[PDB]
């Protein structure tokens, strides 16, 4: 298996084993499996991370300022900010989406994608 | 000899020839499709657990609806769904019915098939392709007028290539037909070729080719329906 | 020759047409209703 | 030796060349355009609708060449120019 | 006649292949879909009861 | 010599050219499309199904050419235009 | 057999070669250019407006070559040079 | 004098050679391209090998099918030559 | 049979080969160079001005072969060497 | 003119076509597969065996076509069908 | 017919093949090298001088092959070896 | 006329086809393998020693087909099958 | 009819085929290798001293194939085997 570490600037948010790490880099959607080759990529502005763990429900994380680093022994996602699916509130995400401010619009779109409404 | 292009049960009517074999094959395929349709209609289960036939029809309808919605709104082209699903099921049944062991010897060493895939006849593919062609051009006319649609198709997305454009507007039907016919015609020949071998060695290549031809027919039906949907979407826009 | 069309064309079309009719009446509408209800 | 026979044999060979070249070009061009389309879909799943447009723009040209060649092959064989 | 025997037993081989390797997966898919719809229905009934 | 002999020799050579071109085009195009599909799935294993819809389109648009050629090859060989 | 028959057969074969090469070239070049354009649109959809200018330049070069080949095939077949 | 069947068979052999040459070129090129894709995918994501072998074999079948159709038609040309007098 | 007929048929076939090869090369080279140009434009529009220079150098190097082939085709067809 | 002479000339040209096509396909496919293997090994020092396996699959697939073509060339030029 | 007629027809067909192959090679190689150059300039604007020399080496090799083919066509056609 | 003359002409054309196809395949496959080797060297200079193994394997797999083609060309020309 | 005329025509056609194939292979392989080296130098400006070794290896293989074709075409043309 592969160990995933979702780390924020202020603190390390999440850390644990997983089975499939989906995300959307600038080039395009990427799915990391246990022995993926080493890689460094930049997550898109409104990126989203989906961690499929062993014997557990998937974890959806909205990511802001994301960066992905695969090392064949652990996947490390460095995020300026992030929010788990449970913590994300729908109404605020809708309000902040489709905003002129590019940063808040990207954050809102990432929250929408993490929730499931896309 | 291969006896390519020969037709059995050929008759005449109203000063016109009619290859009986292809008519019979089309009739049998239509009977099969109608039987499946009425089996579904009798055994529709909106609330309770669905049947296998209901599952098959549901899967096909969902696939066609998804393709249409991706290409053009279902609210804009509802009939395209029945057209695509009927085309798909017709072609698939016609191609798959050839898998049955209906091939024998014609008493002169030339293989003869009791049932031959109707798509192997130019008339069948011509009918399907021309019907789809007329249908989608009429849909375009309805969507964007009687003179608007010809102008749009002639100019296309870029006006300066209007001459070239016309060519594909004539290639769309032909490419739709010949491809299908061609892909089936090969089968109608391949098995015949395999029929030259002695049985004790002829069985193996025939089995392999027919097994692959199952997938080939599935792919051909899917491609025909999908390209019909896409042509409908292209005709009906703006 | 084999590429030249024949009368069968019309006949084939006719058969296809009726099939489409059935597919447009007793297959697609019930299935769409079932999917919408689900 | 019927001169028309030589002329039409040459016409058949020419039509075969026309069709072989057209098929090679159409097949490889379609494969390349389809590779581009499949890569775009894989990397950008939401770009399918806006990708199908340019894909068919280029496929139009690719098949236009092929079917022009097909028409000229039909002229070669059925209406052999210069036939006596 | 000989070619008829050859093609008949070739079709027998084809049917054997279909039942051995193709029938099981399609049957499993049908079972999964039927169980999923039966679930959905039971879940709707239990949600109404709840 | 019977002219029809020359007619048939030319027809067979033309059909060989047609089939060779069609096979080259179909093989290369299918290989390229399969390369696109395989690379896309390797990048995103869960994008398998979504990539089958476009793939086949390309394959269709490829195979068509070859199969179209094949059809005309039969016309060359079994019902030769210009035969005496 | 009159010489004009041999000359016409040679002209038909030459025109077939011309069209085969022109097709191959046009199909392959248009496919490659369309691949480039499709990839560009996939990465940057907003760029579709600014992408057609070089793409159509490439297509014009390719189709220009193909149509020059077509004109010379027409010269070969209809008005055969050297036809006594 | 030239036997017409001699010309028929010469043309048939030429046509079969062309058919098989085109088939071999197409099959080799397509299989090589698909195998390159498979090798790159296995290099990238080793655990996706099983998922990759499916589309790889789909493409390989689609290519070898054209190749073997060309084979069959070459056999038609060479062994039971159409139009033979 | 007049020698000139055989010479002219051979010249026509040779010119057809010349044009076919030239068109294949020109079309595919133009397509590849245009693919490079389109990708470069997609990545960065600002580069367009400096990109048009190497693109023109490439297109010139490609079309040079085509035009030399055209000239030698004209030599073959019109003033056939060794026409005696 | 011995008919067997014409038959054998046709068979030799056919076998030459067989071997030319087989060699083109084998060389190009093996080169592409080897390029894949070389790039994979360059990226990963220790991917050797796991890349050799699929590389061997591809090489075997291509060489199968090459050697089938070679065997049919041998059939063409050693037991010529239609000879008499 | 004159033996020189057959020899000259063969020479013309051979020279046509020479030019077809040379033009295909030149066009394809020039296009590929120019594609590399254009991509390099696009990604590295200031690298024009550094990239030109390798590009000129590649083009020199390609045109060396092409012009050797042209010279041997000239030998085939104007100084046909074995002529008699 | 001499039947052996036709036999040898067909043998020469067949050997020419064999060697042309072999040369095309060998050249392009070696170019592709060299492209892979160059990219590997550029990405990782330390790889230069290790890459030579897969590179040598690929070059061997290509040159093997090329030299088998050469051997069969030599068989075709110097010891022509069916040369009565 | 002089058999040597048929022999020489066949030899010239075979040499044309050999050189067309050799030129195609050489041009395309050299273009591919030059593309690889240009790209590598673009990535690593300090790689000019190291990429040249594998580049020269690849070019040596390609030109070795081309010059072997040169030698065999010279044999076919100037000293035709089977001439009688």
Numbering used by the authors:
A (entry chain H): 3 to 120
B (entry chain a): 10 to 247
C (entry chain b): 23 to 60
D (entry chain M), F (entry chain L), G (entry chain N), I (entry chain O), J (entry chain S), K (entry chain P), ...: 3 to 86
E (entry chain d): 1 to 50
H (entry chain T): 2 to 86
Q: What did the paper state?
A:
Extensive classification of the data for the mycobacterial ATP synthase revealed the presence of not only the three main states referred to as S1, S2, and S3 but also of substates within them. Substates S1a to S1e are in S1, and S3a to S3c are in S3. In S2 (where there are no resolved substates) the c-ring has traveled two c-monomers further round (ca.120°), and in state 3 substates S3a to S3c have all traveled on to approximately the same position, four c-monomers (or ca. 280°) further on. Again, the position of the PS suggests that the order of substates is either S3c > S3a > S3b or S3b > S3a > S3c. The main differences between the substates within each state are that the positions of the PS and F1 domains vary such that the F1-domain (including the α-helical coiled-coil of the γ-subunit) appears to pivot around the PS during the catalytic cycle. However, alignment of the substates via the “crown” in the F1-domain shows that they have identical nucleotide occupancies and that the position of the γ-subunit is also maintained. Alignment of the substates via the a-subunit demonstrates that the c9-rings and the membrane α-helices of the a-, b-, and bδ-subunits of the substates are in identical positions, as are the ε-subunits, and in some instances the lower part of the γ-subunit. Each nucleotide binding site in the three α-subunits and in subunit βTP is occupied by an ATP molecule with an accompanying Mg2+ ion, while the site in subunit βDP has ADP and an accompanying Mg2+ ion. The sixth nucleotide binding site in subunit βE contains an ADP molecule with neither accompanying Mg2+ nor phosphate.
